């Protein structure tokens, strides 16, 4: 019924295939793409022993390098054009979650690299397993490398969460990161509105792991970099243990660095981030109050795209309801502001 790349309804003929022609073309460039991998999971993905409970779900996730030889996906040792991300052995259905969240981001208007769900060749007569596939953004029109760098190295931060002190406190916030970006990329209100929305949407959707390595700079213009596309956007709401560890990967406001102050929302009857905290983030980026008010109204109107995308997805029903429950709650908190 729904496309394994686009999540849009499949017409009469494409129903049995599971993929739409529009989707296959979006992901590969040709409608002749074969989204049924010619290899099995264990053929290329080794079973590494579990490390420690302390690391984020991304630490348990395998990553394969893929190249498109004709209309067939081929695993490469290095320098591929796509990356295959199978679900970790302990987190089943995580690839379906990253696919739903990344599809939602594209439908919301963000710059998201082309992606979809591909199935591995089965070992016997077991149910097909899907992995999330995404095109590498550090490639241009042809497979020529485009230079890029992660924000932790650019800002000269030694930890991706800003835990750079003598304690467990965080020393880099989204407010500081935005201030750094504004000074290195071209300023303009389009860049600022987008980056502000990325931070609000990581919070609304339950992506509490959008750290410094989840921001990049692409060197397309040559001298002046641009912000890299949205990548690794997953909702942690289906995993209660990981979801309650933090509201966001980094503190929202600069006043919160080193735990010196709480955000005004933490001092309210809500005791968590509210719309007022995001207005303060917007204000620090130079966005005008009348513009921030309109941006909040735009996010409220996008409720239908959020609900529909997750409900159309290949995520489990329990997982979808955990995400939409996080979303509805946090969306309601956006009204709590002056």
**What is the binding site for other proteins (CB under 8 A)?**
46, 48, 51, 55-56, 58-63, 65, 77-79, 138, 145-150, 152-158, 160, 184, 186-191, 193, 213, 217, 219, 222-225, 287-288, 290-291, 294
By beta-carbon proximity to other proteins, the closer residue of 130 and 215 is 215
Q: How far is the CB of 306 from other proteins (least distance, A)?
A: 21
Pick between residue 138 and residue 261 the one whose CB is nearest to other proteins: 138
**CA diameter of the chain:** 61
Task: State both tokens at 186.
Answer: 């071209």
Instruction: Give the Cα separation of 235 and 6 in Å (integer).
Output: 18
Beta carbon of residue 133, minimum distance to other proteins (angstroms, whole number): 17
Distance CA 133, CA 250 (A): 27
Rounded Cα–Cα distance for residues 119 and 92 (Å): 14
Sign of CA dihedral 50, 203, 6, 306: positive
Q: Give the nearer residue to other proteins in terms of CB position, either 51 or 166.
A: 51
Nearest Cα neighbor of 196 from 261, 254, 276, 279 is: 279
Nearest distance from C-beta of residue 217 to other proteins, angstroms: 7
Q: How far is the CB of 329 from other proteins (least distance, A)?
A: 28
Considering the complex, what minimum distance in angstroms separates the CB of residue 27 from other proteins? 21
Structure tokens at 84: 């295959």
Residues sharing a CB contact under 8 Å with residue 81, sequence separation 6 or more, in sequence order: 66, 67, 68, 135, 136, 139, 143
Residue 209 is a catalytic residue: yes
193 or 322: CB nearest other proteins: 193
Q: Which is nearer to other proteins, 34 or 58 (CB)?
A: 58
Catalytic position from the list 140, 152, 209, 221 = 209
CB of 40 to other proteins, least distance (A): 18
| CA–centroid distance for 135 within its chain | 14
| Burial state string for 37-57 with b = 16 or more CB within 10 A and e = fewer than 16 | beeebeebbeeeeeeeeeebb
Residue with tokens 């390098």: 65
Pick the closer one to other proteins by CB: 30 or 224. 224
**Which lies closer to other proteins via its Cβ, residue 164 or residue 268?**
164
Catalytic residues: 209
């Amino acid at each position: 019924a729904n496309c394994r790349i686009l999540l849009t309804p499949l017409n009469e003929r494409d129903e049995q295939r599971g993929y739409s022609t529009q989707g296959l073309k979006r992901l590969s460039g040709t409608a002749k793409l074969n989204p049924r991998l010619g290899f099995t999971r264990t053929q290329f993905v080794q079973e590494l022993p579990r490390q420690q409970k302390g690391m984020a779900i991304s630490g348990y996730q395998p990553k394969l390098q893929l190249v498109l030889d004709e209309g067939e996906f081929r695993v490469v040792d290095h320098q591929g054009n796509f990356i295959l991300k199978p679900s970790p052995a302990d987190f089943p259905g995580l690839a379906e979650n990253e696919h739903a969240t990344m599809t939602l981001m594209s439908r919301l208007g963000f710059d998201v690299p082309v992606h979809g769900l591909l199935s591995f060749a089965p070992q016997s007569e077991e149910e097909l397993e899907y992995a999330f596939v995404i095109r590498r953004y550090d490639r241009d029109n042809k497979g020529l490398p485009v230079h890029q760098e992660q924000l932790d190295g650019a800002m000269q931060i030694t930890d991706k969460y800003g835990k750079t002190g003598n304690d467990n406190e965080q020393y880099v916030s989204y407010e500081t990161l935005a201030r750094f970006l504004v000074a290195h990329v071209n300023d303009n209100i389009a860049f600022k509105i987008d980056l502000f929305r990325r931070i609000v949407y990581a919070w609304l959707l339950g992506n509490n792991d959008m750290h410094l390595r989840n921001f990049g700079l692409v060197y397309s213009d040559g001298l002046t970099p641009a912000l890299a596309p949205v990548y690794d956007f997953v909702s942690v709401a289906p995993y209660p243990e990981y979801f309650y560890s933090n509201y966001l990967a980094l503190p929202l406001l600069t006043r919160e660095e080193g735990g010196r102050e709480l955000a005004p929302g933490f001092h309210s009857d809500y005791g968590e981030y509210i719309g007022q905290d995001f207005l303060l983030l917007g204000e620090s980026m130079g966005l005008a109050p009348r513009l921030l008010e309109k941006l909040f109204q735009d996010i409220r109107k996008e409720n239908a795209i959020v609900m529909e995308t997750y409900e159309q997805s290949f995520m489990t029903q329990d997982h979808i309801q955990a995400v939409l429950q996080c979303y509805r709650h946090r969306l309601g908190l956006l009204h709590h502001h002056h």
